[PDB]
């Protein structure tokens, strides 16, 4: 385990997350316009897939915001990392989430895997790849939900479509079966 | 000589190939353009252009 | 053309800021070079005077 | 089985289907004009063959729309593909149809065969070319009908001719034998 390596990788992860969330917000605007165009036509069951894409990306942006927050938290309390040998309570959440989410966002942010390494190679109490996955039952549940790979609720998709239609001056008749239940 | 070398079968096949190749090129162009645009999105914000 | 104009504006601002940064760095490096020449000359003078 | 290969091939299939349905709509307009010209003359039994061509192409365009929908659905729930080892219910229809229709539209869309490969090489429960054809009894029946290679109903052909004639200001006397039965 190297400390300065972890510091540099944390700063890089922060910058990368900033860039990614910016450009993802922009792409989300453009793809929302695309969904509005799709709704202009009679194609409806396809706009639901497109808006699934959109809300997945939005969950992802929120999760990246949370991860940037946690990385900056670790970077603000880095000396408290170097001094102690076991992490305190103030850093349990950050370390846990940054180790749990690394394989999730490993493709988007590469440096995150190095951060996970330095945070797994520094600890031995329930640590190590195997024990690091075993002791991952203390991560932020909200971030787990944002990065949860699951079909979003249908009513949520209908609400997303209703709002986009209402904004882009396009008519849309929600599926009452899901819109009312 | 020519119509023996370049007959109707070969010409039709060659033209189907031309059409399919340039359709594939149409797909490549679309994807390439999507990516080119996605690369430069912070220099050209949609809001500013609007 | 609006996309092109906005892009050119933003990239011109970026190039200007970037050139300012490189100008600062180059001024610092030029100061360092001149001071290194001065320090070398004064070391030689110190040796000769010693 | 490679995941990113499947992702890229799905995106390519989507783009190809878009291009194909566009140009097929255009060609359908032009060939409808041709059928109108054919009906202008006394040639009637030939316009029926031409309109058979047309309605085959229209079935094909609708099937391509459905397939684009399903490919985008898989692409929106790709993580749910990578995580599990057996497909869930939400992806049964997409996978089944994309494996069943691949040999049908293999000539039009080449990448579709690669998609079918990645979706057959990933599963073993009733999977593999032989078992993949054996377990194909759960595909969308509508898409099966759109890609069904069968002589369309004669009354449907008469309705197609009636509409085209009525639109292009050409007289046409439908075959009463089929027009009434």
Query: Cα–Cα distance between D54 and B21 in angstroms, integer?
Result: 24
For residue D12, what are the CA distances in angstroms to C9, D5, D41, D74, D111?
34, 11, 44, 13, 7
Distance of CA A67 to the CA centre of its chain: 7
Query: Cα–Cα distance between A115 and A110 in angstroms, integer?
Result: 9
Give the H or E element holding residue B37. Answer: helix B8-39
Which experiment gave this structure?
cryo-EM
Is residue A31 helix, strand or coil? Answer: helix
Q: Which residue of B has its CA nearest to C10?
A: B43
Closest CA to A94 of A62, A113, A116: A116
How many secondary structure helices (H) and strands (E) does chain C include? 1, 0
Neighbors of chain C by Cβ distance (3+ pairs < 8 Å): B
Contact (CB, 8 A) for A126 and A83:
no
Query: Cα–Cα distance between A84 and A79 in angstroms, integer?
Result: 9
Neighbours of A117 (CB within 10 A): 18
Q: Is A27 on the interface with B (CB under 8 A)?
A: yes
- Two structure tokens written together for A114: 């190095």
Resolution of this entry in Å? Answer: 3.1
Query: Rg of chain C over CA atoms, in angstroms?
Result: 21
Contact (CB, 8 A) for D36 and D170:
yes
Is residue A49 helix, strand or coil? Answer: helix
The whole-angstrom distance between D156's CA and the closest CA on chain A is 23
Interface test with C, best of B38, B45, B49 (most C CBs within 10 A): B49
**Could you identify the residue written with the tokens 């030029």?**
C30
Interface test with C, best of B44, B45, B46, B47 (most C CBs within 10 A): B44
Closest CA to A174 of A164, A159, A51, A52: A159
User: Residue B48: its chain C contacts at CB < 8 A?
Assistant: 6, 10
Pairwise CB contact (< 8 Å): D79 & A149: yes
For residue A36, what are the CA distances in angstroms to A134, B16, C18?
44, 36, 38
Neighbors of chain A by Cβ distance (3+ pairs < 8 Å): B, D
């Amino acid at each position: 385990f190297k400390a300065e390596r972890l510091r540099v990788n944390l700063r890089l992860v922060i910058n990368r997350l900033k860039l990614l969330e910016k450009k993802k917000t922009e792409l989300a605007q453009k793809a929302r316009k695309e969904i509005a165009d799709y709704l202009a036509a009679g194609k409806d069951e396809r706009a639901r897939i497109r808006v699934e894409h959109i809300i997945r990306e939005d969950y992802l942006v929120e999760a990246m915001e949370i991860l940037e927050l946690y990385c900056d938290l670790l970077l603000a309390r880095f000396g408290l990392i170097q001094s102690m040998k076991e992490l305190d309570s103030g850093l349990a959440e950050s370390v846990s989430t940054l180790i749990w989410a690394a394989p999730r966002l490993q493709s988007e942010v590469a440096e995150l895997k190095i951060v996970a390494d330095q945070l797994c190679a520094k600890y031995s109490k329930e640590y190590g790849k195997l024990c690091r996955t075993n002791q991952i039952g203390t991560v932020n549940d909200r971030l787990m939900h944002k990065l949860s790979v699951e079909a979003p609720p249908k009513i949520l998709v209908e609400r997303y479509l209703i709002e986009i239609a209402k904004n882009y001056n396009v008519p849309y008749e929600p599926d009452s079966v899901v819109m009312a239940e | 000589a020519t119509l023996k070398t370049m007959n109707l079968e070969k010409i039709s096949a060659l033209m189907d190939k031309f059409e399919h190749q340039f359709e594939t090129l149409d797909v490549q162009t679309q994807q390439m353009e999507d990516t080119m645009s996605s690369t430069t999105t912070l220099t050209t914000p949609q809001n500013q252009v609007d | 053309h609006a996309e092109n104009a906005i892009r050119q504006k933003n990239q011109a601002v970026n190039f200007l800021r970037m050139s300012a940064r490189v100008d600062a760095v180059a001024a610092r490096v030029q100061t360092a070079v001149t001071m290194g020449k001065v320090t070398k000359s004064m070391a030689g003078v110190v040796k000769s005077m010693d």
